[PDB]
From Swiss-Prot, chain B:
Originating gene: dcsE
Name of the protein in its database record: L-serine/homoserine O-acetyltransferase
Enzyme class: transferase
First-listed, main subcellular location of the protein, grouped into a coarse class: cytoplasm
GO cellular component: cytoplasm
Keywords: Acyltransferase, Amino-acid biosynthesis, Cytoplasm, Transferase
Top-level taxonomy: Bacteria, Bacillati, Actinomycetota, Actinomycetes, Kitasatosporales
């Protein structure tokens, strides 16, 4: 397939040519999205959610697609992001493979998948495509734009490029740009894929493809998404309970391989490369003629209030990067609540430790309501 | 070349039939070693150094091989491990590829490299081979046994299986067994090598072989040998200075540069064996297994010990060095535990001598 689209996906066509930041334009492209909760009469309770690199737009379950969403505990009736109050809109990032146009999508000019002919992807493109989607839904101003991980970058790009589109912002484990360690990690992940003979320079198509490289990319990711101490605490030196040369012997290995399979079977290799690359290239304050770098860009944003959170154990987007976002937004007049979370779940905390990330989000939205 | 042997290496032959912990034995095998400083007439100033996974026995430069050693700043005249006071003996771990018998060595039975026919390697084997080496050199009791990283495990195994052989012990960033995170990392490193089409199930020929995989294995290692925060502050987002989806950042060019240097001088199969041994070792299994690891430590007979670790070490976390210190102390050893405030993580004992050197010099000054 190379494209894995949720059954209740809806789409917004990106009209005519959609110009990409680093050159070229997409034609016949679209953004896959899903909504949760009722949009009110004034259309002023819309909340946009920009995702991390790997999820689809199915953030939460719904009667028409009861399968749990990737953020099931965060979004829903009576939950931190209460769908009884908000009209949540989640979009599949442009460049992905869960419905929105990406490398695995068909190029109308050739009738074949774009593969590596897909225009270089930028975080700004993901932001612009999401902005168009929200406007196409008849919403001129979001009550809030939520961004987590890669989505934190996408959200900042949206706030900088479409200042009148969001009243408030919730930034979870985001950054204005990637630091060396995370660049090194993503570099190795992309390497695991490009080093797999099955990649065939991106022309693996219906073939098996670089599946082994994908499993590995996912393993390396998982290992850096949560604190080393937490791993030692969850598995210890326990051997595999399931009971030929140099094969797995520890439960931690079994665990990683297990979840790695789910990713390798549900993600397009080329799409991963493009998204991974976009994350490394993003730099909030590098252009526009405004000055002040990232802090300057944040100060110029027009959000009224913002909630910024990060995990103390996050080694991909360290806490200091979340503090930087909070400081920059506040420097520009926004009423900012910053909250460092004492969790061992690192970068995955906003996904797996909603028991800690959830209450502060609810508290902030209660004020926005 | 299959093996990368320092020019002034010396060798001690292991007895034919040398038993390996997990089965099998070695015939015509040997341990490569080097010495620094003179042994006194009484033969009571010998210091054994068991290394981490990657180095050879050339810990310091010498007249017959002036090339700088892997521990140049730590071993030498007037240095932390003063060669003016000690006869330092550094051995290449069994299973390695720097002189001591390992996967890259010639199997006398076939006249060809062992490759994956080499018996599965255990940390205890490395300790036993080292013990034989010291005794073969006419030394009945070491003034001290120094173990760093993987060598920390080797040293503990030696202290447990040959208690009459060492008076004191310096343990640097070691552990009684590997924790989940380190196991996962090494598992990925071994995977990068085995996933490389040039591996050929260990039957790669001279020239390159699974070079790309070895590069990746080393890069992942470097990334975890030092603080993530230290990485961020060291390179920033600087692009590569020299003019699809290839490298673009300096941190990447840095990693590749040093990764290749490693790949050029290490045998893939040897790497697999040593890496696997690190995951399999558990000090608690020895000595009847009474009291697990803590019990084994208390049963050791060392009189004094210095145990150091880096606060930022994510492979062998500080808590593991604390465990070693407590176990030895509970057994009656006069222990000095020193957590080092350094960002260099696991590589600290190698690159932050300013913080690791003084303590070692002080401890040995007392042992003298």
């Amino acid at each position: 397939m190379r494209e894995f689209i949720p059954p209740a996906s809806r789409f917004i066509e990106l009209p005519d040519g959609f110009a990409m930041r680093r050159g070229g334009a997409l034609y016949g492209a679209r953004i896959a999205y899903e909504t949760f909760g009722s949009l009110n009469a004034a259309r002023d309770n819309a909340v946009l959610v920009l995702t991390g690199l790997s999820p689809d737009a199915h953030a939460a379950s719904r009667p028409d697609d009861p399968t749990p969403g990737w953020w099931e505990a965060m979004v829903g009736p009576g939950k931190p992001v209460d769908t009884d109050l908000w009209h949540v809109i989640c979009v599949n990032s442009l460049g992905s493979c869960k419905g929105s146009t990406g490398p695995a999508s068909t190029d109308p000019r050739t009738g074949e998948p774009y593969r590596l002919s897909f225009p270089e992807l930028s975080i700004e493109d993901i932001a612009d495509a999401a902005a168009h989607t929200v406007r196409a839904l008849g919403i001129s101003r979001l009550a809030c734009v939520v961004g987590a991980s890669m989505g934190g970058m996408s959200a900042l790009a949206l706030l900088a490029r479409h200042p009148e589109l969001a009243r408030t912002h919730i930034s979870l484990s985001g950054a204005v740009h990637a630091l060396p360690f995370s660049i090194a990690v993503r570099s190795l992940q992309r390497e695991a894929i490009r080093s797999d003979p099955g990649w065939l320079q991106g022309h693996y198509d219906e073939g098996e493809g670089p599946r082994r490289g994908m499993l590995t990319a996912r393993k390396l990711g998982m290992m850096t998404y949560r604190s080393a101490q937490e791993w030692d605490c969850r598995f210890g030196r326990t051997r595999i309970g399931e009971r030929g040369r140099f094969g797995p012997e520890f439960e931690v290995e079994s665990y990683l391989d297990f979840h790695a399979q789910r990713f390798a079977d549900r993600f397009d290799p080329n799409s991963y490369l493009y998204l991974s690359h976009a994350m490394d290239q993003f730099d909030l304050g590098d252009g526009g003629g405004g000055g002040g770098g990232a802090p300057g860009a944040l100060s110029r944003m027009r959000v009224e209030r913002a909630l910024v959170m990060g995990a103390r154990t996050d080694i991909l987007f360290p806490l200091s990067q979340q503090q930087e976002i909070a400081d920059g937004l506040s420097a520009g007049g926004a009423d900012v609540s910053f909250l460092p979370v004492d969790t061992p779940a690192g970068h995955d905390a906003f996904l797996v430790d909603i028991e800690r990330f959830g209450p502060p989000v609810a508290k902030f939205l209660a004020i926005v309501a």
